[PDB]
Amino acid sequence: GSHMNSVTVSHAPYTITYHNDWEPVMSQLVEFYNEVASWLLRDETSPIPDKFFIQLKQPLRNKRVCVCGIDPYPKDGTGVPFESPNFTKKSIKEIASSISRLTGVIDYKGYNLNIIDGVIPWNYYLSCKLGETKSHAIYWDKISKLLLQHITKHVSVLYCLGKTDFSESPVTTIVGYHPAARDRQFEKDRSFEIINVLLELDNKAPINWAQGFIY
Amino acid sequence: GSHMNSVTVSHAPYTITYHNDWEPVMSQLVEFYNEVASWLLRDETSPIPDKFFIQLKQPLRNKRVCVCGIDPYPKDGTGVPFESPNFTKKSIKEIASSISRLTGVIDYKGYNLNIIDGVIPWNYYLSCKLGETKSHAIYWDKISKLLLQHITKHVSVLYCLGKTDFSESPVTTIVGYHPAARDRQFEKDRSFEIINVLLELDNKAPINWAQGFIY
Where along the chain is the active site annotated (chains A, B)? Predict the structure, then answer.
């Protein structure tokens, strides 16, 4: 569209297009990515390099919640965090169930966090070696820090998913269970519910979690 | 007592005694404080140098909430954050009122966060030039970071008081209004209430806020 820009990097995907809201961090991102990309690309990745940076197409100014996982699905990442086109990945399924139990919406065939007003779904690390979670942590390090720090300047609540997974200006942060953690249904459910209360506290409009449903 | 240690610093207060729980950070603290203390001491301070570090006598392992202000009272700091022996400072008075409105406890003559099980009250900066808030920020910088980072390794919830005041491993953090902020009574009240819910989420025992009352 007519509200975006792009930068050139020396390695695949060679071009990153991004929303104006990301501009402040883009030249630092280019530097860091040229330093590490040769080492990232040696492996088949989730997602493919062409989809590493597609979430930078998302605007930040209209966002108030960030739902953040550690890295993309071991396989089948689309570049949109949590996205599972054919609704097969356990993570998004469990998230959908919580929102079902919270909202009362019974029947659905999918769920996607990328279509909820005021929500940016996010992967801390933007890739992993195909089949291996956290396997690209070292490469993403400085970029992961830069991008999250930028996000927290816009959103009012950061919700990170996975306690042991997640081992400058403080924002309201919640660290809850991994979406696929066993026998922690109450805590997973309640964790989502709290977000809207915290937003009320910060004088922000609630999130309509039901917007994520696909029928 | 028989569960504590001490270190020698080159400037006033010359000796810091501390609980075993603080040990990991103490030699880094000594280094930083000898680098900056000459510049801190040129001014009359709140609290007096003898009371800068008295909160390091507090154990951390039994704590699950940190209630954290930016720095000590402009005047009359005792070394215990939020402490006001004669119950005169607006900050602790407003905190007491919230807990009154939350709990239903009507009659009291004081309130102190330092006597509540599972709560560590905390000043981010450990001093200020007498009469000037944030006036010692530059001196405390690296120590302030070190000590808070250590605290968040023990507590499950960090509650920071003052949005514009507060401009490695993520813990559950709430940033609420300054205790003395005008016409924000609901948000101040509700902010405290949320802490116990978050603790429930993290499978921790609630805080008994009424323990802070003095009759």
Answer: 71 (proton acceptor)
B47 in Cβ contact with B56 (< 8 Å):
no
Distance CA A188, CA A178 (A): 8
DSSP-derived secondary structure letter, A205: P
Listed residue (A215, A178, A188, A214) closest to A101, CA to CA: A188
What are the structural domain ranges in chain A? 1-215
Q: Which two tokens stand for residue A75?
A: 């396989």
Distance CA A69, CA A180 (A): 12
What does the alpha-carbon distance between residue B96 and residue B209 come to, in Å, rounded to a whole number?
9
Q: Give the closest of A175, A187, A197 to B172, CB-based.
A: A175
The residue of chain B nearest to residue A201, with distances taken between CA atoms, is B187
Method: X-ray
Write the CATH number of the domain with boundaries A1-215: 3.40.470.10
Burial A154-171 (b: 16+ CB within 10 A, else e): bbbbbbbbbeebbeeebb
Nearest to B126 by CA among B150, B145, B152, B149: B145
SS3 A66: strand
List all residues 6 or more positions away from A109 whose beta carbon is below 8 Å from its beta carbon: A87, A214, A215
Strand partners, B129: B45
Cα dist from A32 to A20, A36, A127, B110, whole Å? 20, 7, 15, 54
CB B158 within 8 A of CB B152: yes
Nearest chain A CA: its distance from B39 CA (Å)? 25
Q: Which residues of B touch A190 (CB under 8 A)?
A: 197, 200-201
Rg (chain A; Cα; Å) = 17
Question: Resolution of this PDB entry, in A?
Answer: 2.3
Show residues of chain A in contact with B175, CB under 8 Å.
Answer: 170-172
> Other CB atoms closer than 10 Å to residue B206's CB: what's the count?
13
Rounded Cα–Cα distance for residues A136 and A125 (Å): 7
CB count within 10 Å of CB A101 equals 15
Q: Which residues contact A202 (CB under 8 A, 6 or more apart)?
A: A156, A157, A172
Catalytic residue among B21, B43, B71, B76: B71
B67 neighbors B161 (Cβ within 8 angstroms): yes
A21 is catalytic: no
